[PDB]
Amino acid sequence: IPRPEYPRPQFERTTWVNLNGTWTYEFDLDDSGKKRNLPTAKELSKTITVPFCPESKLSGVNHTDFIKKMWYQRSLPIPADWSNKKILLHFGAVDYLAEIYIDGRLVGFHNGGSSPFVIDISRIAKPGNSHNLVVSVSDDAKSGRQACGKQSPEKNSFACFYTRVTGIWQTVWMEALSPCGLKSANTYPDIDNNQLIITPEFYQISNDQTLEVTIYDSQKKVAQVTSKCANGSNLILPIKNIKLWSPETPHLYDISYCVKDAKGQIIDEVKSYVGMRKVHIANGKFYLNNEPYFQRLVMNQGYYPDGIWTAPTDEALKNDILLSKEAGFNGARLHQKFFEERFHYWADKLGFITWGESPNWGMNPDDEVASRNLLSEWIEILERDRNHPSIITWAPLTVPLSGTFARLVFDLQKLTKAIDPSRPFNDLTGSGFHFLTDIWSISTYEPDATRFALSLKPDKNQAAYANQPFIIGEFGGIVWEEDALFERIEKLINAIQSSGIISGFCYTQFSDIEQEKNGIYTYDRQPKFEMERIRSIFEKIPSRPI
Ligand SMILES: [Mg+2]
Ligand SMILES: [Mg+2]
Ligand SMILES: [Mg+2]
Ligand SMILES: [Mg+2]
Ligand SMILES: [Mg+2]
Ligand SMILES: [Mg+2]
Ligand SMILES: [Mg+2]
Ligand SMILES: [Mg+2]
Ligand SMILES: [Mg+2]
Ligand SMILES: [Mg+2]
Ligand SMILES: [Mg+2]
Ligand SMILES: [Mg+2]
Ligand SMILES: [Mg+2]
Ligand SMILES: [Mg+2]
Ligand SMILES: [Mg+2]
Ligand SMILES: [Mg+2]
Ligand SMILES: [Mg+2]
Ligand SMILES: [Mg+2]
Ligand SMILES: [Mg+2]
Ligand SMILES: [Mg+2]
Ligand SMILES: [Mg+2]
Ligand SMILES: [Mg+2]
Ligand code: NA
Ligand code: NA
Ligand code: NA
Ligand code: NA
Ligand code: NA
Ligand code: NA
Ligand code: NA
Ligand code: NA
Ligand code: NA
């Protein structure tokens, strides 16, 4: 079974099934599948390896041309000892519109090709029996309604656009739990008050139901509290001598969640973790844990030669972060894609700061329906990723290459502040223009290093300018297939270093991708250059100044 690992490792139960592996599929050229009763089909015409999209080699299908409509199918065995449980069916992502059938009946649907969804099958699922699961998939970027990221709008890859991703591109899985279990737990690290706040949510709360929370440093229990179950009520976990999370020291505390019925019997157990860290802007600087922090970022566009949007293995996700740090970067912009959850896990574990962004390219910037679609995907991703210490900035919009766009800029700023005030917000990347931002990013690919140094200033005449930390969001981009190359990159880093007013940078980019040969690494993650040299250049500006 491919990608067998637990797909939600910051909220982990043991009672799950991985549904990756061999499914059946069909392309539906004339959109006739419903006429041909595909929802009651027990086997479709061909086979595919989920969770790899059909454009991928790892799917075994390798069909890169446009796929407008397709169908997936497999048998869904429900384990016998899931008796009388709540049973959830989870899809990480399906591009773009998914309609879910069980035993031929429509049980759910999801609009948004990059965001997770869940179907409560508690009422339909018959433990110790097998159902027929059929998934209908639509994908039509030409509509202008879809957030596509870097997926090519042309048949072939060209310029900065790459291979498409249709259908199921993340792990499909099921879990069973108490009807009265823990739906979620938001973690709020508060380093100024030496404590962790937890806000729980339960599916249902019975007679005298309690939740017990224990915090661990390794095996050492450092905090514990019990409470009577109430949605949205605060549990306070005091932590003396907090071990702070940073890229340089990625310390995590373990959490156990224990839900008990009126008899003190355990009905639900969940495992989690947290990184005790604080991020805020003040006085023109960016602060990690109440001290300045210099961001040494590389642009990561999250493409893999054999899996396209899908990492071939857990190891390939982890390895992108290790290769990023070996090049001297302390973090990445996660660009034009919602990354897989386990990527944020390895960023949490290995020590790596990230910007969470969106695949906003490929939407018609005059279509309010495109705006409507991105707002809901964005909410789903904030819900999915809000507990990750590695994410230290949200940046949901890159300018594309008519106030609908300006309206969406302000709506995402207000929505994101309301959902998550813990992280700085960057309203707009890829230009020098801002509407309302915590972060003053600019983009400069000026090849001449004298002209480059002079481009290194914010436009303070813009109404939005309010002494925000100044970040070079995009620079470099040097195309390659040596000493000459190293000089060029070193000249840019020294100009940034000499500036005295810059809070961080992001180098374009981590790896080559198809025709774009502007990575530090090849597309198959091989060094292009003497790594000792690369690292000594990109590491020159320290994480912690002076
Ligand atoms: Mg997995
Ligand atoms: Mg589970
Ligand atoms: Mg894939
Ligand atoms: Mg999926
Ligand atoms: Mg989806
Ligand atoms: Mg069915
Ligand atoms: Mg579109
Ligand atoms: Mg969308
Ligand atoms: Mg596509
Ligand atoms: Mg697939
Ligand atoms: Mg690969
Ligand atoms: Mg995995
Ligand atoms: Mg995406
Ligand atoms: Mg991350
Ligand atoms: Mg959209
Ligand atoms: Mg930032
Ligand atoms: Mg943005
Ligand atoms: Mg709009
Ligand atoms: Mg950008
Ligand atoms: Mg901009
Ligand atoms: Mg960049
Ligand atoms: Mg190299
Ligand atoms: Na996964
Ligand atoms: Na889900
Ligand atoms: Na979907
Ligand atoms: Na993309
Ligand atoms: Na982006
Ligand atoms: Na994001
Ligand atoms: Na974006
Ligand atoms: Na962005
Ligand atoms: Na915005």
Kindly write down the DSSP assignment for every residue of 434-490, as one continuous string: -SS-SSEEEE---SSHHHHHHT-S--TTSTT-SSPPEEEEEEE------HHHHHHHH
In terms of Cβ atoms closer than 10 Å to its own Cβ (0-12, 13-18, 19+), residue 228 is exposed
Give the distance (Å) from ligand 18 centre to CA of residue 189.
33
> From ligand 1's centre to the CA of 466, what distance in Å?
43
Coil, helix or strand for 78? coil
Among all bound ligands, the one having the nearest atom to the CA of 167 is: 10
Ligand closest to the CA atom of residue 345: 14
CA gap 221, 216 in Å, rounded:
4
User: Are the C-beta atoms of 376 and 111 separated by less than 8 Å?
Assistant: yes
- Number of the ligand closest to the Cα of 306: 11
Distances (CA, A) of 7 to 12, 172, 365: 9, 9, 33
520-531 as b/e, with b when 16 or more CB fall inside 10 Å?
bbebebeebbee
Q: How, if at all, do strands 253-260 and 266-274 pair?
A: antiparallel
- From the CA of 114, how far away is ligand 8's center (Å)? 7
User: Residue 535 CA: which ligand is closest?
Assistant: 22
Terminus-to-terminus CA distance in the chain, angstroms? 50
Question: How many A from CA of 318 to the centre of ligand 27?
Answer: 21
Is residue 361 a contact partner of residue 149, using CB atoms and an 8 Å limit? yes
Six-digit token string for 440: 């003053």
Query: What CA–CA distance (Å, rounded) separates 59 from 191?
Result: 45
What's the gap in Å between 378 CA and the centre of ligand 28?
7
Three-state secondary-structure class, residue 539: coil
Give me the residues near ligand 11 (ion), CB cutoff below 5 Å.
304-306, 312
Ion ligand 28 residue ranges (Cβ < 5 Å): 356, 381
Question: What is the strand order of the sheet 285-288 is part of?
Answer: 279-282, 285-288, 291-292
**Could you tell me the two tokens for 535?**
């690292």
DSSP 249: S
CATH of domain 279-539: 3.20.20.80
Strand spans (E) along 289-352: 291-292, 295-300, 331-334
Cβ neighbourhood burial of 127 (10 Å; 0-12, 13-18, 19+): middle
What is the CA(4)–ligand 5 centre distance, in A? Answer: 19
426 C-alpha to ligand 31 centroid (Å): 7
What separation in Å is there between the alpha carbon of 415 and the centre of ligand 20? 19
- Report strand pairing: 210-217 vs 220-228: antiparallel
**Closest ligand, as measured to the CA of 335:** 27
**Euclidean distance between CA atoms 326 and 521, whole angstroms:** 11
Residue 156 CA to ligand 26 center (angstroms) comes to 15
Nearest ligand (C-alpha, residue 285): 16
